[PDB]
Every structure is written in structure tokens, then in C-alpha cells.
């Protein structure tokens, strides 16, 4: 290929373009769900004061 | 032009002349291959800059308290990882008269064959990691877990394999098999010698090979997922994301100049000077596997696993090693090579000095063992880059 700051050819890796070409934010495609209580499901909910 | 030159297409030995007896089909043409990964992983919208995936990581917390007992403070915390594309590309070149005649539709044939070669490169770069680019993060074969299936596939996939997958808190969602798996699903009999997976007169195809389910999980079939001892996979295929910045471009010229040699020993040919025509082909792909330990590799019986241990040049303290969650003593960062083998067979399990092997030196050991191996660097004073990894076929 070519050097990172090659003197003849401009390239996207060149220091000159830093802060342009920033990678786009996205959804967390690996987000796991909020784990809900099991105890509140199995056990009988009494009124309490 | 040089006739039958290795780069250029031209009227040479490859063509009969298009006489009437030439059959309209190669009656023995096998149907063209296609990507597996592009039909099982999440396709994510992606651009040339690449993308950032954020993730949560806080120990957000709350405590029981007494009457009037003043309340505690807590934290969220957040992190990110970036993902980038890589190009795959090629050129093919033909005499202008070959482009004119298009013998046997060679130009159309090439334009499909390159597209298939690119699709197959994307599969193998993701499955087996063979010649994978720097930008891809992880490949399936890099997993730390293996299960053999060959004597009885049900006990293999549904029971033994599932045990070592759920014990890490990972989960089973799909299974992906090579067509060479057919004769180990066929048979897989009960003790009375009836097969599992097929109905009481054996006329039907075998249930998973219908693309049917196994214990609720779908089965994906392939003619090319196998390599080495590996014949398939099972895991959480939601952990794979992939992207493609643009479709296969095709770009065409008589006017340009190529090099037929390597870069440092070039042989420049002007396409116009020799009246050749060239076609450029390229596409950009991206891939990420969230972690490679979410998959169990499937094999026939006697499989054995090789790991490479890398302390990043760390200089005081201890690591320790584990098989199947059983844990050895502390081992010095510079311990003499037979010490590692001694510390492994000192596990409370049936591993022994005839099965286990090791090679290398201080902080560069290669370990071979009949199971799931993991390492802990908590005893090491400057282990700030310390790591372990799974070795390929060769």
C-alpha cells in the first residue's frame, strides 16, 4: 500500500482528515432485556400496611 | 499477444469453436454455491466510515436500610466498540475480440463466478477465519468449546453439547450443519436399533435435513460449512452482526494500464496498446461477533484442543489455569515448561500425562488438552495485557 501520511497521495487514514469520517452511532444490537422478578410472579401478593 | 498467457483471455486451447454438436448445457454442471453467514447473522445498515456499537456496564445498585438510616450513592457506567469495513476485490482481463464474441458466454460466466468467489470468501473469513482481514472482529472457529456428536447425535447436540453451552450463561438458538452430517443423523439409533429423527417406515427424509427443528431450534444446512475436524456449529446466532457498504461494483476499460507482475517486479501492460479489455470487481464487508465463546463447535468423536497463552511480556507474579471450571494452584509467570503440564494434570479430573501436552517457554506456552481450557491473571502484578487464544488448523 502506502505510508499513513504519504506525501503524494491523499488517503482516508491521513492525519489531515481526523475528526471528519467519524464512525456513526448505532443501536446496541446486543442489548439483553431487563431481568424481571420471579418471586413477585410465583408468590401470592397480600395487602400490607 | 502471447496465446494462453496466464492473465489474459484470448482465442486459445480453452475454446472448441462453436460447432453444432456443442451441448447447450454442461449436463454435469453442479449448481452454484452461496453464502451461509449472510442468511443467519443480523444484517446491519452500514456506511464507509464504519459504525459504533454502545454498551451498558454499570453496577447500578440499592441497599436495604433501617428507619432514618441515611441512604447510599450509586453509579451507571457505559462503553463502546467501533466496527469497520474491509474491501475484497479482483480483476479479470480478455482480448477485445474475446469480449466481442463472448465465447460460451465466458464474460457472463466470469461475472457470476467472481460474485460467488467473493460470497465464499466472506463465509470462510467469518466461519474458519482463513485469510480474514484485519477489520473483522472474531471468527466462529475461534471458540473455546467443542462437542463431538458421531455415535448418537441426540446425546451430542441436545444433552452433552448443551450442558457446556448453558453452564457459561450462553444459550442455544440455532444449529448449522454440513451435508456430510447426514450419515451420523441417519442411524443414531435407540437401543432397539430404530433410528431417531425419522418416521416409522423410513420413507421420509431425516427431520433436521428437511431444515426442520431439533428441540425447538431450527437447523441450517450447508454444502461447505465443514473444515478440518469441524462439521457444524450450535449457539446464539444473535451474537453475529454483519454489513455491506455497497453491492458488487463492476467497472470496465480498454483504456487503462495494468501490472501483470508483483509490485516490486512490475510488468506494465497498457490495455489499449495490446487491445485487451479489463473488468474491476469489488465489494466492502463488515463483521462483528460479540464474543466467540457463544458457539460450540461440532465434530466426530476423538477431538483434542490447542490453546496459545500470551502474558504480553509481564514480569512478576502468577497466573492460574482451569479445565471444566476446576481450578489449579498459582503458577509463576516464568515457570519451566514441564511445570505447566504438571499443574494441568494436578486438576481433580481424569486428564493425564499421556493425553496432555505443552511446548514453548516463560510466558509463550502452547497448551494441548482434551477439553474447555481457561486462564486467570489475577495473581500477576503487571499482567495488564495478559491473554489466552485458540489455535487453528494448518
Amino acid at each position: 500500500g502506502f505510508s499513513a501520511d504519504h506525501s503524494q497521495i491523499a488517503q482516508t487514514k491521513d492525519t489531515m482528515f481526523t475528526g471528519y469520517l467519524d464512525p456513526v452511532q448505532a443501536k446496541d444490537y446486543f442489548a439483553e432485556a431487563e431481568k424481571t422478578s420471579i418471586v413477585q410472579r410465583v408468590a401470592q401478593k397480600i395487602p400490607m400496611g | 499477444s502471447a496465446d494462453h498467457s496466464q492473465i489474459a483471455q484470448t482465442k486459445d486451447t480453452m475454446f472448441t469453436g462453436y460447432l453444432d454438436p456443442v451441448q447447450a448445457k454442461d449436463y454435469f454442471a453442479e449448481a452454484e454455491k452461496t453464502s451461509i453467514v449472510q442468511r443467519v447473522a443480523q444484517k446491519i445498515p452500514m456506511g464507509a466510515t464504519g459504525i459504533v456499537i454502545p454498551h451498558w456496564t454499570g453496577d447500578v445498585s440499592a441497599q436495604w436500610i433501617g428507619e432514618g438510616d441515611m441512604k447510599p450513592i450509586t453509579k451507571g457506567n457505559m462503553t463502546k466498540r467501533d466496527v469497520h469495513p474491509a474491501k475484497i476485490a479482483t480483476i479479470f482481463v480478455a482480448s477485445a475480440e474475446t469480449v466481442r464474441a463472448n465465447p460460451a458466454n465466458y464474460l457472463g460466466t466470469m461475472r457470476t463466478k467472481v460474485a460467488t468467489a467473493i460470497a465464499m470468501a466472506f463465509d470462510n473469513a467469518a466461519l474458519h477465519g482463513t485469510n480474514a482481514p484485519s477489520a473483522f472482529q472474531g471468527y466462529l472457529d475461534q471458540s473455546n468449546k467443542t462437542q463431538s456428536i458421531s455415535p448418537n447425535a441426540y446425546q451430542g447436540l441436545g444433552v452433552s453439547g448443551l450442558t457446556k453451552l448453558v453452564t457459561d450463561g450462553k444459550k442455544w438458538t440455532h444449529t448449522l450443519l454440513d451435508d456430510t452430517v447426514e450419515p451420523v443423523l441417519n442411524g443414531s439409533v435407540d437401543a432397539n436399533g430404530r433410528p431417531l429423527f425419522v418416521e416409522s417406515t423410513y420413507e421420509s427424509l431425516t427431520t433436521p435435513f428437511r431444515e426442520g427443528r431439533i428441540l425447538g431450534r431450527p437447523t441450517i444446512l450447508s454444502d461447505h460449512v465443514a473444515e478440518g475436524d469441524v462439521v457444524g456449529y450450535a449457539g446464539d446466532f444473535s451474537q453475529i452482526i454483519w454489513g455491506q457498504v455497497g453491492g458488487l461494483s463492476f467497472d470496465v476499460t480498454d483504456q487503462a494500464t495494468l501490472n501483470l507482475g508483483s509490485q516490486e517486479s512490475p510488468n506494465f501492460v497498457s490495455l489499449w496498446q495490446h487491445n485487451l479489455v479489463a473488468v474491476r470487481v469489488e465489494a466492502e464487508y463488515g463483521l462483528l461477533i460479540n464474543d466467540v465463546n457463544a458457539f460450540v463447535k461440532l465434530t466426530f468423536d476423538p477431538v483434542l484442543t490447542t490453546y496459545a497463552l500470551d502474558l504480553d511480556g509481564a514480569s512478576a507474579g502468577n497466573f492460574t489455569l482451569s479445565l471444566d471450571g476446576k481450578t489449579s494452584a498459582n503458577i509463576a509467570y516464568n515457570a519451566s515448561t514441564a511445570t505447566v503440564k504438571s499443574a494441568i494434570v494436578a486438576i481433580d479430573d481424569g486428564v493425564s500425562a499421556d493425553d496432555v501436552t505443552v511446548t514453548g517457554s516463560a510466558g509463550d506456552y502452547t497448551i494441548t488438552v482434551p477439553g474447555t481450557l481457561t486462564a486467570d491473571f489475577s495473581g500477576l502484578t503487571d499482567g495488564e495485557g495478559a491473554s489466552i487464544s485458540v489455535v487453528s488448523v494448518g
Binding site: - | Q23, A24, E32, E97
Partner: protein, 450 residues
């Protein structure tokens, strides 16, 4: 019974197998490179300069460019009069579907493929508004398909179609983007067909017959699958003429100039430099070469080749291209002198006209059939018996001469006292089956004035 996945396999083999039978006949109409055309006298480096010949295109166009459907003539069950009911008559029902499908454009293309490849297929269907069928949705959607995109199995006992596949290649690679199977009972379509990993869409139809009909160029009763109109004799003279042109094209470069020679030269005295092998003469016209000569030195020429020898052989092939095709000889320029009269026009056109009337009879037999299926599909029920007797009606293939027929038809009709009724005079002047209705309205309006 039969298996529809197995037919999806089996038909695509038969369709692919067929393509090489068409491939040769295409090359004559496209005028592509063919080995037999190459002029054997031409040196291998010049053999790149091919010399294509236009007879097959000229002949197939000079038929297909000269037939148009005017309409249909379904007879009434009682009181027969096609002038009587207009938009209420069944002959107009059929014609509306001909206009609305643009068949007056697509038929004149489909007939060219039916002549080049010996067959092409009419296909009948109902339009689906879940798809971009921008047409009147109460009209049966009729298409013509070339044999480069459709294959139909024919029962040799009955000429009925048994089943058929239509296949669509993509832009590239001959990848089969989509395939459609037509059965006696149903139609099925697979929407990504390069190994058919898509699921079948399906649509039943009421017809007891497959909704596809072969137009086919029958040369003979024995000719049961139809045959290319570009006959072996017309191919043979096309290739034979190509060799003469290519041999002449070499001759005009290599041999048309008499080669000059001098014998008894001493190259050192002529000043022919050894390392270049050349003396630089001056070519200005008046100058005389004085050569030192002696020892029997003398000058002489090889002759030119006389290109008349090839040109007087091309003219015999211009005549046999006329003889074997039946074109008017001036269409090949095999002679240049025009037919001077409305009679000499008919004499020259005679063979071509009777050949087009013959094609119109046979291609009429496809549309006279297909309109029954279109009717039986869209109107349902069963065919009203008269439709089995319908004629197609075609424009006269003759070159239109007006001023000759005008003085004839005027003298026949004799201001209403004459030998024939008005509406026959309109047929003989050649006004079309629809234009005669436009007139039959204007005639009534003029009769309110005088």
C-alpha cells in the same frame, strides 16, 4: 399424477437444451460472426476484417413488416350483419382487448420472432392489483413471449400443449431470476429462481387447457413444431456471398495495384542502403528514372487482379438471393429499373404477396384460438358455439395504390345505380373493419345535409 417441483426441474432442462437450436438462426438475422462466411483467400492477419451480408434480415423483415390484423369476424347465430350492433357485437369485444393490450404493436414484434425462431408463444392471464399491472383490470392480460424465454411441451397426438415454463434471466450470468410454470390446472411462479430458494406463489384457473398458445411457422403438414423462415438455401447463399465480399476486400488491398519489378540491379549502385533495405525515390509525376543498367537489366510488372472477376460473380448471387426468397428483384437491387405501372407493381410484388397471405392464414390460426381462451377465462362459463367459426381478418399485403382503385370502385358503384352496394365498395377501396364504422356514422350525418 405428477410432481410440480420435479416439473420445475425437468422443464428448465428442456428450455436450456433448446437454446442451441435457436442460436444458429439468430446469428443469421443479427449478422454475427460465422465460420463459414470467412473468405478463405484472405491472409490470417487480415481475416479480422469480416464482411457481413444482409439477405436474411432483408427477407424476414420484408414479410413481418407487411402484415397487420384488422379484426375478427365471429358470425351471428341469427340475422348475420357485422354492420348492425357496433359496440354490442362480440367481434368488437375481441377487438377492444386487442387495442387495450397494445397487441397491434406486440404482435408485429412477436411475428418476427415466430419467423426467426420458427415459433413464439401467446400467453393469457388475469391482472393482479397487488402488482403494478397498469392496465384496465376487467381486460384479460395477454402477452407474447419469445422462445428465448419460454418452452412448451406439445402432445404430438393432438397438437395440444401439455405444460410450459417461462423463464426470466437477470441482467447477467444467465442467472434465472424468476421462473413460471403453466399447468392444465394452475399457474405457479418462483420469485428468486437461481436454485429456486423462494417459495411458490400460485394461482388456479378455470381452463381445462394450459393458458399458452404457440404461434409457429409451419412450412409443411409434417412440420409439427414449426421451423425458421431463414431457409437453408437462403443461409447457403448468404454465407457463399460473404466469402466473395471478403476475398474482394483482401483483393482491393493486396492485388488491385500492379506490382513493379526491376531485374539485374546491383543494390550498391541503386543506392539501396543495407541496414534499412530502402532507396528513397521521389514520386513527382514528370521525372524519368535513369538506371546505370547493362548486363541484361530490365523492368516489368505483375498485373493487378481484375476486381470485375469478383463483381460479375456477386451479381449471380444477387439473382439467386431473389430466386430463393421470392422478393421483388429491385428489393435486392438485382436489377434497378422500376415497374412503371399499377400492373407492373402487381407483377413484381406477386410472390411476396402470396407468401404473406399464406403466413396470415397460419398466424391467424393462433389468434383465432387464443381469443377463445381469453374469452373463456375472463367471461367464465363456456364458449358460445359461434366463436369456433371466427375468422381473423388482415390488411391486404399489397403495396397500396389508391388512384387505380378509385376509378375502379367509382365505376362499379355508379352513384348508387351500380353493380355493388356501398359497403362493398368500401372494402374494395381497402378501408379497415373499424374505419368502415367511422364512415357509417359520418354518412348518416352528411345525409342530414344533402
Amino acid at each position: 399424477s405428477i410432481d410440480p417441483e420435479k416439473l420445475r426441474d425437468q422443464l428448465l432442462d428442456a428450455f436450456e437444451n433448446k437454446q442451441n437450436e435457436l442460436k444458429s438462426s439468430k446469428a443469421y438475422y443479427d449478422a454475427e460472426r460465422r465460420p463459414d462466411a470467412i473468405g478463405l483467400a484472405v491472409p490470417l492477419d487480415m481475416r479480422k476484417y469480416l464482411a457481413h451480408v444482409g439477405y436474411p434480415r432483408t427477407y424476414v423483415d420484408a414479410i413481418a413488416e407487411r402484415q397487420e390484423l384488422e379484426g375478427f369476424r365471429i358470425p351471428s347465430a341469427n340475422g348475420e350483419e357485422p354492420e348492425s350492433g357496433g359496440e354490442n357485437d362480440p367481434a368488437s369485444e375481441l377487438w377492444d382487448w386487442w387495442q387495450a393490450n397494445n397487441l397491434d404493436i406486440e404482435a408485429t414484434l412477436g411475428h418476427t420472432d415466430a419467423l426467426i425462431y420458427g415459433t413464439a408463444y401467446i400467453t393469457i392471464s388475469m391482472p393482479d392489483p397487488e402488482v403494478d399491472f397498469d392496465v384496465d383490470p376487467e381486460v384479460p392480460l395477454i402477452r407474447v413471449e419469445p422462445p428465448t424465454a419460454l418452452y412448451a411441451e406439445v402432445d404430438p397426438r393432438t397438437r395440444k400443449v401439455l405444460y410450459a415454463i417461462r423463464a426470466i434471466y437477470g441482467a447477467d450470468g444467465n442467472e434465472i431470476v424468476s421462473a413460471t410454470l403453466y399447468l392444465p390446472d394452475t399457474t405457479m411462479t418462483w420469485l428468486r429462481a437461481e436454485g429456486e430458494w423462494e417459495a411458490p406463489t400460485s394461482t388456479p384457473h378455470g381452463l381445462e387447457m394450459v393458458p399458452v398458445i404457440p404461434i409457429s411457422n409451419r412450412t409443411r403438414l409434417s412440420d409439427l413444431y414449426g421451423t425458421s423462415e431463414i431457409s437453408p438455401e437462403l443461409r447457403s447463399v448468404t454465407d457463399a456471398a460473404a466469402q466473395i465480399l471478403m476475398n474482394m476486400q483482401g483483393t482491393a488491398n493486396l492485388m488491385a495495384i500492379p506490382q513493379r519489378l526491376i531485374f539485374g540491379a546491383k543494390p550498391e549502385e541503386l543506392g539501396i542502403n543495407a541496414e534499412t533495405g530502402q532507396r528513397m525515390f521521389d514520386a513527382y509525376m514528370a521525372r524519368i528514372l535513369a538506371f546505370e543498367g547493362g548486363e541484361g537489366a530490365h523492368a516489368e510488372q505483375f498485373s493487378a487482379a481484375e476486381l470485375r472477376n469478383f463483381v460479375d460473380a456477386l451479381d449471380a448471387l444477387d439473382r439467386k438471393a431473389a430466386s430463393y426468397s421470392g422478393l421483388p428483384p429491385q428489393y435486392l437491387s438485382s436489377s434497378s429499373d422500376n415497374p412503371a405501372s399499377a400492373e407492373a407493381i402487381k407483377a413484381a410484388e406477386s410472390r411476396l404477396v402470396k407468401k404473406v397471405e399464406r403466413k396470415n392464414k397460419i398466424f391467424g390460426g393462433a389468434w383465432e384460438q387464443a381469443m377463445r381462451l381469453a374469452y373463456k377465462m375472463v367471461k367464465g362459463g363456456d364458449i358460445p358455439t359461434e366463436y369456433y367459426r371466427m375468422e381473423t381478418v388482415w390488411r391486404d399485403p399489397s403495396t397500396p395504390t389508391y388512384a387505380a382503385k378509385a376509378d375502379a370502385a367509382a365505376k362499379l358503384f355508379a352513384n348508387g345505380a351500380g353493380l355493388i352496394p356501398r359497403e362493398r365498395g368500401w372494402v374494395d377501396m381497402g378501408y379497415t373493419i373499424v374505419e368502415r364504422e367511422q364512415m357509417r356514422q359520418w354518412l348518416e350525418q352528411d345525409q342530414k345535409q344533402g
